[PDB]
């Protein structure tokens, strides 16, 4: 598997500066483009 | 449940934790009579109806019936955050629709401790040796364990189910079977553990003749 | 309606002659109206009368749980005697009959290995001692931990897991304080299975 | 526990030269006089 995307995902998952909408948006970009 | 029976299966632990995977909730309906075939599925995420489902009908089972399954892709974060997933099953040979609900186990998550153990001296007599991966202190029991050597996956392993410990946490042991020669040659065997309480939902502990 | 469950004796109880093996007949969901439950115990088709029917316990859901316990001989269970429980109640059309015997299959002798704590675990105040028990058949087994002859109160055993060769394997985890290990305190893993000589084996582990 | 009692039982349980009655009698003697 790709560790970079995994790191990016866990970062977005636990970022306190992101709300539900922003968290899901970031995760979606990781899931699709990473 | 009731014959036709409805079973709701949670996503695979690995799938909800790894962004490279696609976690899904599976809605299986067994014992659906030969006479009455068609079945309708209605998926609900915390009340709200969703339509991204891959609805499936009849697939014959021995006792003159059919297996009616349904796949609904879920967001990793949505499962791990505690969202409830509902499946409404409709059938003509059924008096009222069946509603099953599944969600991630509630409680404070605890970080798993991964330990690798070489084979016992008493086992160095057999042509095949056992490598152990002790995984303790984790919460909830949702976890995935894999073995690998030189980047390539090692699949001749058997993992115990999570066992409830006295402190409320879960533990397990994954046993990998390897040839005595391979262990004694210096080969490095790694154990990969995936859990929500772990950083990046992933850790890897290595073991070799050292 | 009323449901009947017939449980075998504890693996340890059938294997150790100092113990008392017993077959348990559990009856659940008995209505308040007609609570009278009659048990008839049969051993190889012949009716026995040594059963002790425990006083009817009341459940929150207004149901009754009536249990009958039947003491058995170690040799009788181990030699293959069939234990039949017949349960009669008026809220039942015909009496429910349940039959149990010893687990079938060719028994296989388990190999017992003791694994010390990992070098990484030595940073924690409590360490884990392991007991790998493998190649046993059938799954009926009892695993225990002792020290200086007296048992340990911090241990948990995994359920038997099916190996690729068709036999079973398990791990018993003993949790001790790190200092305990570091003295040279001896810890024993005692395993009880029908295929082991004397139904018993003990493997030791120390620093 | 008494290991001698356990040894004597396993041997009586597996003695090929004993019939049910003889084996049951021997096992009884072991069990009662540990």
Tell me the sheet residues that pair with C32: none
> Which H/E stretch holds residue C129?
strand C126-136
Query: CB–CB of B134 and C163 under 8 A?
Result: no
D31 vs C contacts (CB less than 8 Å): 17-18
Comparing alpha-carbon positions, the chain C residue that sits nearest to B176 is: C163
Q: Which of B142, B143, B138 has its CA nearest to residue B105?
A: B142
What is the C-alpha to C-alpha distance for residues D3 and D34, in angstroms, rounded to an integer?
9
Distance from CA of B98 to the nearest CA of A (A): 31
DSSP of C15-44, one letter per residue?
A: H-TTS--EEEEEEEEEESSS---EEEEEET
Query: CB–CB of B177 and C164 under 8 A?
Result: yes
Distance from CA of A7 to the nearest CA of B (A): 5
Q: Which of B175, B206, B21, B205 has its CA nearest to residue B112?
A: B205
Tell me the sheet residues that pair with B139: B110
What is the C-alpha to C-alpha distance for residues C153 and C172, in angstroms, rounded to an integer?
13
CB B130 within 8 A of CB C134: yes
Query: CB–CB of B173 and C130 under 8 A?
Result: yes
Distance from CA of D17 to the nearest CA of C (A): 15
3 state DSSP class of C187: strand
Comparing alpha-carbon positions, the chain D residue that sits nearest to C18 is: D31
A23 and chain B: CB distance < 8 Å anywhere? Answer: yes
Subunits in contact with chain A (3 or more CB pairs closer than 8 Å): B
What is the C-alpha to C-alpha distance for residues C198 and B29, in angstroms, rounded to an integer?
49
- Exposed (0-12), middle (13-18) or buried (19+): which is C140, by Cβ within 10 Å? buried
Residue with tokens 């985890």: C173
Tally the C-alpha atoms within 13 A of residue C126's C-alpha that lie toward its C-beta.
Answer: 10
Strands C187-192 and C142-147 turn out to be antiparallel
C129 vs B contacts (CB less than 8 Å): none
Query: Chain B 54-83, CB below 8 Å of chain A: which residues?
Result: 75-77, 80
What is the C-alpha to C-alpha distance for residues C205 and C202, in angstroms, rounded to an integer?
10
Residue D33 DSSP symbol:
T
Q: How was this structure determined?
A: X-ray
Tokens standing for residue B131:
């490598």
C16 and chain D: CB distance < 8 Å anywhere? Answer: yes
3 state DSSP class of B10: coil
Beta strand spans in C82-123 (E) = 83-88, 96-100, 111-115
CB C76 within 8 A of CB D13: no
**Dihedral sign from CA coordinates of C138, C140, C146, C150:** negative
Distance from CA of B24 to the nearest CA of A (A): 15
C151 vs D contacts (CB less than 8 Å): none
3 state DSSP class of D14: helix
Query: CB–CB of B163 and C159 under 8 A?
Result: yes
Strands B39-45 and C142-147 turn out to be unpaired
Tell me phi and psi for residue B130, to 5 degrees.
-105, 125
Tell me phi and psi for residue D32, to 5 degrees.
-75, -30
Residue A6, sorted as left (phi over 0), alpha (psi -120 to 50) or beta, turns out to be alpha
Q: Which of C179, C71, C202, C191 has its CA nearest to residue C142?
A: C191
Those residues whose C-beta lies under 8 Å from the C-beta of residue C86, and which sit 6 or more positions away, are C39, C40, C41, C42, C95, C96, C97
- Cα C24 to chain centroid distance, Å, stands at 12
B77 vs A contacts (CB less than 8 Å): 13, 23-24, 27
Tokens standing for residue C102:
């010893």
CB A13 within 8 A of CB A27: yes
What is the C-alpha to C-alpha distance for residues C42 and B188, in angstroms, rounded to an integer?
58
First and final C-alpha spacing in chain C: 58
Those residues whose C-beta lies under 8 Å from the C-beta of residue B101, and which sit 6 or more positions away, are B8, B84, B85, B86, B87
> Over the Cα atoms of chain B, what is R_g?
21
- Determine the residue among A2, A9, A33 to mutate to test chain B binding: the one whose Cβ has the most chain B Cβ atoms within 10 Å: A9
Q: How many CB atoms lie within 10 A of CB B203?
A: 17
Distance from CA of C185 to the nearest CA of B (A): 19
> Which H/E stretch holds residue C173?
strand C168-177
Comparing alpha-carbon positions, the chain C residue that sits nearest to B210 is: C119
Facing B18 at nearest CB: one of A6, A23, A27? A6
| Alpha-carbon dihedral C196, C43, C41, C30, rounded to 10 degrees | 50
CB C174 within 8 A of CB C127: no
What is the C-alpha to C-alpha distance for residues C30 and C2, in angstroms, rounded to an integer?
6
C118 and chain B: CB distance < 8 Å anywhere? Answer: yes
What is the C-alpha to C-alpha distance for residues B199 and B203, in angstroms, rounded to an integer?
7
3 state DSSP class of C132: strand
Facing B132 at nearest CB: one of C115, C154, C170? C115
What is the C-alpha to C-alpha distance for residues B74 and B25, in angstroms, rounded to an integer?
7
Those residues whose C-beta lies under 8 Å from the C-beta of residue C36, and which sit 6 or more positions away, are C89, C90
Q: Between the CA of residue B170 and those of B202, C160, C162, what are the distances in Å?
A: 17, 16, 20
Tell me the sheet residues that pair with B148: B153, B190
C86 and chain D: CB distance < 8 Å anywhere? Answer: no
Query: In Å, what resolution does this model reach?
Result: 2.6
Q: Which residues of D21-32 are buried (b: 16+ CB within 10 A; e: fewer)?
A: eebeebbeebbe
Q: How many CB atoms lie within 10 A of CB A13?
A: 21
Facing D27 at nearest CB: one of C16, C75, C200? C75
- Cα C131 to chain centroid distance, Å, stands at 18
Query: What does chain B come to in residues?
Result: 210
3 state DSSP class of C72: coil
Q: Please count the helices (runs of H) and the strands (runs of E) in chain C.
A: 3, 17
Tokens standing for residue B11:
């996503």
Strands B170-179 and B128-138 turn out to be antiparallel
The angle at the Cα of C7, spanning C66 to C103, to the nearest 5 degrees, equals 165
| Alpha-carbon dihedral D17, D19, D25, D28, rounded to 10 degrees | 80
Tell me phi and psi for residue C75, to 5 degrees.
-60, -40
Beta strand spans in chain B (E) = 5-9, 24-33, 39-45, 48-50, 54-55, 60-61, 65-68, 70-73, 85-91, 98-102, 113-117, 128-138, 144-149, 152-154, 157-159, 163-164, 170-179, 189-194, 202-207
Tokens standing for residue C77:
């269970």
Distance from CA of C163 to the nearest CA of B (A): 7
Facing A6 at nearest CB: one of B75, B77, B202? B202
Residue C78, sorted as left (phi over 0), alpha (psi -120 to 50) or beta, turns out to be alpha
C37 and chain B: CB distance < 8 Å anywhere? Answer: no
- Determine the residue among D7, D13, D15, D32 to mutate to test chain C binding: the one whose Cβ has the most chain C Cβ atoms within 10 Å: D13
Those residues whose C-beta lies under 8 Å from the C-beta of residue B29, and which sit 6 or more positions away, are B4, B5, B6, B7, B39, B67, B68, B69, B70, B89, B91
Domains and CATH numbers, chain B: 4-103 (2.60.40.10), 104-209 (2.60.40.10)
Facing D6 at nearest CB: one of C73, C78, C198? C198
């Amino acid at each position: 598997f790709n560790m970079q995307c995994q790191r990016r995902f866990y970062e977005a998952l636990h970022d306190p500066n992101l709300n539900e909408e922003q968290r899901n948006a970031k995760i979606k970009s990781i899931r699709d483009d990473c | 449940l009731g014959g036709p029976s409805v079973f709701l299966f949670p996503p695979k632990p690995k799938d909800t934790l790894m962004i490279s995977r696609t976690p899904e909730v599976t809605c299986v309906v067994v014992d659906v009579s030969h006479e009455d075939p068609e079945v309708k599925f209605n998926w609900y995420v915390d009340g709200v109806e969703v339509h991204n489902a891959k609805t499936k009908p009849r697939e014959e089972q021995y006792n003159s019936t059919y297996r009616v399954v349904s796949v609904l892709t879920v967001l990793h974060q949505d499962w791990l955050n505690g969202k409830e997933y509902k499946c409404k099953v409709s059938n003509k040979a059924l008096p009222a629709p069946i509603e099953k609900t599944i969600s991630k186990a509630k409680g404070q998550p605890r970080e798993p401790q991964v330990y690798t153990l070489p084979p016992s001296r008493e086992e160095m007599t057999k042509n095949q040796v056992s490598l152990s991966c002790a995984v303790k202190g984790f919460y909830p029991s949702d976890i995935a364990v894999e073995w690998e050597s030189n980047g390539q996956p090692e699949n001749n392993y058997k993992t115990t189910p999570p066992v409830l410990d006295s402190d409320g946490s879960f533990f397990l042991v994954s046993k990998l079977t390897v040839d005595k020669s391979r262990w004694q040659q210096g080969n490095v065997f790694s154990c990969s553990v995936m859990h929500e309480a772990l950083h990046n939902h992933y850790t890897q502990k290595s073991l070799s003749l050292s």
